[PDB]
Every structure is written in structure tokens, then in C-alpha cells.
Amino acid sequence: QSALLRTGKQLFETSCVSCHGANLQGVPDRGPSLIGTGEAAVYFQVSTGRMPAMRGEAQAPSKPPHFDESQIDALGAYVQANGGGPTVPRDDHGAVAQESLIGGDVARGGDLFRLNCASCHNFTGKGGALSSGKYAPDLGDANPAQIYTAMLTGPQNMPKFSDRQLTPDEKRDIVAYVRESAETPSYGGYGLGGFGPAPEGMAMWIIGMVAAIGVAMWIGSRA
Amino acid sequence: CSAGQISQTTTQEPAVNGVNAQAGQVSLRNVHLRAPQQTDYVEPGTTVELLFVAANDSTEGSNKLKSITSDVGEVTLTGDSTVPADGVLIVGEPDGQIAVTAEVELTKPITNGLLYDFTFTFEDGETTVAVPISAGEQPRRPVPPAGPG
Amino acid sequence: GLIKNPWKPVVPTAEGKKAVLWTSGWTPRFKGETIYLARATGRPGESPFVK
Amino acid sequence: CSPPGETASSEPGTTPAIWTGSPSP
Ligand SMILES: CCCCCCCCCCCCCCCC(=O)OC[C@H]1O[C@H](O[C@@H]2[C@H](O)[C@@H](O)[C@H](O)[C@@H](O[C@H]3O[C@H](CO)[C@@H](O)[C@H](O)[C@@H]3O)[C@@H]2OP(=O)(O)OC[C@@H](COC(=O)CCCCCCCC[C@H](C)CCCCCCCC)OC(=O)CCCCCCCCCCCCCCC)[C@@H](O)[C@@H](O)[C@@H]1O
Ligand SMILES: CCCCCCCCCCCCCCCC(=O)OC[C@H]1O[C@H](O[C@@H]2[C@H](O)[C@@H](O)[C@H](O)[C@@H](O[C@H]3O[C@H](CO)[C@@H](O)[C@H](O)[C@@H]3O)[C@@H]2OP(=O)(O)OC[C@@H](COC(=O)CCCCCCCC[C@H](C)CCCCCCCC)OC(=O)CCCCCCCCCCCCCCC)[C@@H](O)[C@@H](O)[C@@H]1O
Ligand SMILES: CC(C)=CCC/C(C)=C/CC/C(C)=C/CC/C(C)=C/CC/C(C)=C\CC/C(C)=C/CC/C(C)=C/CC/C(C)=C/CC/C(C)=C/CC1=C(C)C(=O)c2ccccc2C1=O
Ligand code: HEC
Ligand code: HEC
């Protein structure tokens, strides 16, 4: 659709030339080339709000998006027309697929996530720190399409898992585990962040020991 | 500390299978070879496609592409290989694209994973790219089922 | 009874029995043995490793 | 101290040959 292409370029000119160039070749030491990244990379980077970036640092953080769904599609089509690349999955009505990406085998997705993702995102997608100022953000806010596009395009330091390394059905199983492990309530009480022993030791010292010492004060005497 | 002149985000390369190259004044982006494979090698005589996008850094004049050569075979250029003033020249039509093409007639076998040198000349600079082979949006080829051992 | 020799050759390799710490799954059991780089499919049983 | 059996080399190296595989497991 020529309407979608010129809208995407018109949006691109006033938002993405300073760092990516007018012809999407990239600006050295300011931004890489966008040729061949595909519509999937643009969808993830804009819908997650990661782009447009504001400065150079260790890692560009997520923030509220600067464009809506229609403008994201226009921007994706413009970049897609220059070099091709992967595309975001879509449903029957042509909208971005969200529910249809939920796989039916969460047990397989859990093993795949623990093999391929747990290392950077933690047992239950709570996030993890990387080498120098970089980190794997918590996965509780990404919709299934965003997780699929992140696995497809491999943003920043995340590996670019291809449809051959991880088949569409394997990706759907992984996002099913990601979506369910974030929406599953804790069974033994308050989750304490799900980070493991570190919050557990902090909670003990600040709650149980404080109560135990406070009770000891009430029963015992001073001086 | 991480926001100084040496920044991790600013120097990052695109997460694509292509190769960036500087041919004097023309920017070669997403340079890759399309070659479906069946065995350990793509035998000589097979016709593969070389795909890339040429970006004109200059905005005053025009440029034209000539004489793509490599030690893997002969490269044939079909179409108007001229890049506009401040535009792009898309050579090849990759997957996900709803006509300049680079046709390579192989002389020696090639395989995915290695690098093969290609030479680009426009009018003002000749550079070598060491082009890789990139499978695009093609699905994973089936693997024969293993027996019980 | 608890004491065990770490370097008793118990692992069959291409050049005789070797200690456990000197070997791994990638140590050839005979000359010219083909060891594939297999990927874990994530499903228990029914080909967990494929080429 | 540094590990004696860990030194960088300047030799370029060659492309590995295609694997054949010997019989008789
Ligand atoms: C005598 C003493 C003995 C008594 C001791 C007992 C004390 C314990 C009291 C509390 C018990 C509660 C029982 C109910 C348990 C429950 O049913 O649980 C509900 C759910 O709730 C959370 O779901 C959130 C959402 O609902 C989800 O939608 C959302 O997804 C999820 O997000 C996670 O998941 C996402 C991916 O999905 C990630 O993206 C994301 O990042 C994150 O991980 C959310 O979770 P989260 O943000 O963790 O916190 C949210 C918390 C907000 O925090 C908190 O509670 C903080 C407060 C408690 C925590 C522990 C203390 C911390 C101590 C530290 C040491 C502090 C540091 C100090 C430093 C100093 C020293 C250092 C040197 O809001 C609340 O609940 C509000 C409730 C507040 C109630 C207060 C109690 C009132 C007491 C009054 C008593 C009166 C008595 C008077 C007598 C006279 C998760 O847990 C779920 O699993 C869990 O299922
Ligand atoms: C008087 C009291 C206090 C006084 C202090 C105030 C003044 C201090 C002045 C310091 C200078 C400020 C400059 C800031 C700007 C800056 O920094 O930008 C420079 C660039 O530098 C790095 O690039 C390097 C190149 O430019 C690149 O070309 C190159 O490639 C790259 O090479 C790395 O990277 C490559 C990847 O490409 C790899 O290939 C390669 O191998 C390698 O790893 C380079 O990197 P690297 O060597 O890391 O150097 C980084 C910085 C280093 O930072 C710093 O200042 C570090 C901060 C030190 C401060 C001291 C601590 C004080 C503690 C408290 C005071 C104690 C409490 C007191 C107690 C109470 C009092 C009681 C009495 O060097 C410098 O600036 C020079 C340092 C000189 C400072 C001298 C101070 C020493 C202390 C003396 C005190 C004496 C006191 C005695 C009293 C009697 C990158 O960061 C770039 O992005 C960045 O852009
Ligand atoms: C190697 C090593 C020791 C590393 C630490 C280095 C380091 C710089 C530590 C602290 C740095 C911090 C706190 C950065 C924030 C920026 C900042 C404000 C700096 C301090 C400025 C300053 C000194 C002046 C202000 C005055 C002052 C002293 C106030 C600061 C007080 C605060 C907020 C300190 C807390 C810091 C700290 C280390 C505490 C973490 C405690 C732990 C173990 C938390 C684990 C934990 C987590 C992570 C949960 O997710 C969770 C979820 C649900 C329930 C519980 C928890 C829980 O406890
Ligand atoms: C400079 C401050 C930038 C602006 C403005 C925009 N982008 Fe950007 N982008 C920038 C950097 C330094 C990087 C690389 C590291 C990173 O944070 O990811 C990027 C990355 C992208 C990508 C991913 C490329 C990949 O290899 O797949 C995309 C798709 C992208 N940027 C698009 C984009 C768009 C559409 C922008 C306008 C809204 C935009 N960027 C602004 C730097 C900067
Ligand atoms: C470490 C090397 C990682 C591995 C392995 C995986 N992920 Fe990751 N992921 C990593 C980083 C550093 C980032 C942030 C990149 C950015 O451009 O800002 C991400 C991002 C994601 C996201 C987006 C999350 C959002 O903010 O909502 C998702 C959904 C995600 N990662 C999922 C994911 C999955 C399913 C993985 C297994 C295949 C996986 N990641 C691996 C770091 C790393």
C-alpha cells in the first residue's frame, strides 16, 4: 500500500534520520544500518518504546511508545521495503497476532526457556544483570507479539534466534511459558519478587528478627 | 562511565546476516548471498543471487555500479545499476518484499558458514566485502528421523 | 570404603581407558567416530536431540 | 601468574576439511 509506505517515510524523516540516516544506511558512532532488519525489528523497537533512542549509554531502556499501532505499521513497512527481513506475525483480520501466538505445550516451553532464556532473564523472567551497565529486563510486561519479535530480531545483546534455530511452534511454546509464568500467582504467600534467597534473607532480617527482638524487649528489661 | 565517548550502544552493528562496506562514497548494506542448499556444498554451475543495498553518501552527484567480480564465478548485473543523488539502489529482491539483480554463475563450490570475497567498483573506489551466505525467511529443512540406535 | 582413586582409567576412549576428568562426551570412543553437534529440542523423549 | 599453555597466535589457519567418519563402532 503506497499510503502506508509514504506515511512511514514521512514519520521516519523527522524521527529516525539523525541516528539512522536518510537512506537507512546508519550514522557511524550514532546508529547502525536499518537495512535488512525487517518489520519485526521495527515493531519490537517502537512498540516497546525503545525507539527513538535519546542518548548513547550502556543500554537503551524501555519507555512509553512514541507512536501508536498505525504509525508502527507504517514505520515497519518503510523499513521492510528497504532490505526486507523478518515480519511480525498477523492474524486473520490483519492485526498483530497476540492470542494465536500462545503455544499449547507449556512444559516444552519451560524447558526451552530454561535452556535458552533463564541464563539472562532468570528462572521466571524477572530480569538479570549483564557485564557493564547492561541487563536483561523483567518479562512481565511484554505481550506475546513483543516476545516473538524479540526472539526473532535479537535486540541489543539478546541473541537473534532465527526461525530455523527456534521453529515458530517452539517460539509459541516459549511465549506461552513467559506469559503464564508472569500471570501465575504465588502459592506460598507473597512472592517477594521471585529473585530467590536474596529477598528471602532481607525479609527475614527486617520482619522476623525485628519482631523477635522487639518481643524480647517487651518481655525483657533494660539496663 | 558508560555514557562517555566509548559507548556500547552507539558502536553496535545491525543484527542482520549482511555485511556493511564502504566503497569510497557508496555504503553497501545487508550484503549477502542467497543460495538454497541440500548437501555440504553448492556445486559449481549452480546459479545463486547476490543481494545488497547501495547508499549514496553524497547528495550532489550520481553514481553507477560496474564490474562486480569474485573468485567464485562470474557475476552478471542486469538492470539500471545507477544509484540516484541521495537515494538507494536495491540489487536483488529478498524474502518479505511483496529490478537490478546480481546473478553469480559458480565456478567453485560454496557452503553456508564461510566467507567469499567480492569486489565492488562504482567509479571512485574498489573494495572487497568478503560476502557471506545468508538463509532468509526459509523454514528449517527437515531432518531424517533417527532410529533406536 | 569411601576412598576412591581419582585417576583409575575407567572411560573407554580411542587410545585406551582414561580417567574421568580427562574425558567427556566429545572424547572419541574410536578413531574416526562421528560426533554430531545436536540441539536439545526441549521435549522429553521422542528425539530430544536432533542434528 | 598466567597459564603457560594459553598464548595468542598470529597464524591465520585453514578451513577445516569435510568430515568422513570411520566405521566399526
Ligand atoms: C508479628 C510479626 C509477624 C507478621 C509478619 C508477616 C508480614 C507479611 C505481610 C504480607 C502478607 C500478604 C499475604 C498475601 C499474599 C498474596 O496473595 O500475594 C498476592 C500477589 O502479590 C504480588 O503481585 C503483584 C501484582 O498483583 C501482579 O499483578 C504483578 O504481576 C506483580 O509483579 C511481579 O511480577 C511481575 C511479572 O508478573 C513483574 O513484572 C514485577 O516486577 C513483579 O515481580 C506484583 O508483585 P510485586 O511488584 O512483587 O509487589 C506488589 C505489592 C507491593 O509490595 C509489597 O508488598 C511491599 C510490602 C511487603 C513486602 C516484604 C517487605 C520488604 C523488606 C525489605 C528489606 C525493604 C528494604 C529496606 C532496606 C533497609 C536495610 C538495607 C541495608 O503490592 C501489594 O501486594 C499491595 C498489598 C499491601 C498489604 C500490606 C499489609 C498490611 C499489614 C497491616 C498489619 C496491621 C496489624 C495491626 C495489629 C494491631 C506477587 O507477590 C504475587 O506473586 C502474589 O500472588
Ligand atoms: C584532589 C582530590 C581529588 C581529585 C580528583 C579530581 C580530578 C580527577 C581527574 C580525572 C580525569 C577526568 C576525565 C573525565 C572524562 C573521561 O573520563 O573521559 C575520558 C575517556 O576515558 C576512557 O577512554 C580511554 C581512551 O580515551 C580511549 O581512547 C581508549 O580506547 C580507552 O582504552 C580502554 O578502552 C579501550 C576500548 O576501546 C580498550 O581497548 C583499552 O584496552 C582500554 O581498556 C581508555 O580507557 P581507560 O584506560 O579505561 O581510562 C579511563 C580514564 C579514568 O577515569 C578516571 O578519571 C577514574 C577516577 C579516579 C579518581 C580518584 C579517586 C579518589 C577517591 C577519594 C578522594 C577518597 C576519599 C578521601 C578521604 C577523606 C579525606 C581525608 C584526608 O582515564 C583518564 O581519564 C586519565 C586518569 C588520570 C586521573 C588521575 C587521578 C589519580 C588519583 C590521585 C590522587 C592523589 C591524592 C594524594 C593526596 C596527598 C573512556 O572512559 C571514554 O569513554 C572516556 O571518554
Ligand atoms: C559489591 C557491592 C557491595 C555492591 C553495592 C554497591 C552499591 C553502590 C550499593 C548501593 C547503591 C544504591 C543503593 C544505589 C541507588 C542510588 C543511591 C540513592 C545511592 C545512595 C546515595 C546515598 C549514599 C545517600 C542517601 C542516603 C542513604 C544512605 C539512603 C539509601 C538507602 C537505600 C535505599 C539503600 C538500599 C541499598 C541496598 C543495597 C539494599 C538492597 C537490599 C536487598 C538485598 C534487596 C533484595 C530485594 C529485592 C531485589 C526484591 O526484588 C524484593 C522484592 C520484594 C521484597 C523484597 C525484595 C528485596 O529485599
Ligand atoms: C539516536 C539517539 C537514535 C534515534 C533518534 C533512533 N535510533 Fe534506532 N537505534 C539507535 C542505536 C544506537 C541503536 C542500536 C542499539 C539499540 O539500542 O538497539 C538503534 C537500534 C535500532 C533498531 C534495531 C536494529 C537492529 O539491528 O535490528 C531499530 C529497528 C531502530 N533503531 C529503529 C529506529 C526508529 C524507527 C527510530 C525513529 C523512531 C529510531 N530508531 C530512532 C539510535 C537511535
Ligand atoms: C542474554 C544474553 C539474553 C538471552 C539468552 C535472552 N535474552 Fe531476552 N533480552 C535480553 C536483553 C539484554 C534484552 C533487552 C534488549 C533491548 O533491546 O532493550 C532482552 C529483551 C527481551 C524481551 C523484551 C522485554 C520487554 O522489555 O518487555 C523479551 C520478551 C525477551 N528478551 C525474551 C527472551 C526470551 C523468550 C529468550 C529465550 C529465547 C531470551 N529473551 C533470551 C537478554 C537476553
Spell out the SS3 assignment of B74-87.
Answer: EEEEECCCEECCCC
Question: Contact at 8 Å (CB) between A78 and A8?
Answer: yes
The number of angstroms, rounded, from the C-alpha of A189 to the middle of its chain's C-alpha atoms is 27
Cα–Cα distance measured from residue C45 to residue C38, given in angstroms and rounded to the nearest whole number: 14
Contacts A29 to B, Cβ<8 Å: 10-11
> Which one of A19, A23, A82 makes the best mutation probe of the B interface by having the most chain B beta carbons within 10 Å?
A23
Nearest residue of A to residue C41, measured between CA atoms: A112
- Does residue A186 have its Cβ closer than 6 Å to ligand 1? yes
**Does A touch C (3+ CB pairs < 8 Å)?**
yes
Please tell me the distance from the alpha carbon of residue B6 to that of residue A132, in angstroms, as a whole number: 12
Known binding residue A121? Answer is yes
- Which residues face B2 on adjacent strands? none
- Measured between CA atoms, the residue of chain B closest to residue C51 is B143
Helix (H) or strand (E) holding C12: strand C11-13
Mutation test residue for ligand 2: of B1, B2, B5, B6, the one with most atoms within 8 Å of CB: B6
Q: What is the resolution of this structure in A?
A: 2.6
HEC per residue, chain B = CCCCCCCCCCCCCCCCCCEEEEECCEEEEEEEEECCCCCCCECCCCEEEEEEEEEECCCCCCEECEEEEEECEEEEEECCCEECCCCEEEECCCCCCCCEEEEEEECCCECECEEECEEEECCCCEEECCEEECCCCCCCCCCCCCCCC
3-state class of A29 per DSSP?
A: coil
Q: Is A93 annotated as a binding residue?
A: no
- A126, A135 in Cβ contact below 8 A? no
**PDB experimental method:** cryo-EM
With a 6 Å cutoff on the Cβ, whether A156 touches ligand 4 is: yes
Name the closest-CA residue to atom 8, ligand 5: A158
Whether residue A89 is preceded by a cis peptide bond, meaning omega within 30 degrees of 0, is: no
